[PDB]
């Protein structure tokens, strides 16, 4: 028989107890917590070292902000 110590009595001993005896819950939570913690702490390291961010794609016809200068050619 294996009893629950509780997370509060000993932290790392509870982590070891969950790893040996409830491996589906411990590893489900480990794969889940590896996501957003890495999304917080690993993306500025990538932008500083691996490659910077891509330029944005266009979505419609790109209008400039000008005032219709005259054009020559193809009158008739």
């Amino acid at each position: 028989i294996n009893a629950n110590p509780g997370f509060w009595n000993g932290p790392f001993r509870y982590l070891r107890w969950s790893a040996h005896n409830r491996p589906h819950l411990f590893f489900a939570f480990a794969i889940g917590i590896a996501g957003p913690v890495a999304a917080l702490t690993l993306t500025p390291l990538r932008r500083k070292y691996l490659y910077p961010d891509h330029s944005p794609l266009p979505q419609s016809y790109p209008l400039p902000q000008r005032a219709r200068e005259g054009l020559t050619g193809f009158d008739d």
Binding site: L63, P64, R68, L71, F74
Partner: peptide, 27 residues
């Protein structure tokens, strides 16, 4: 610049649209 002139004319005359920038969609 011709395509830009067409779309920029079509922008400046809103809802005019079809008839008032025909002269540039020619070019």
């Amino acid at each position: 610049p011709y395509n830009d002139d067409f779309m920029l004319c079509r922008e400046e005359s809103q809802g005019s649209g079809a008839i008032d920038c025909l002269k540039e969609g020619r070019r």
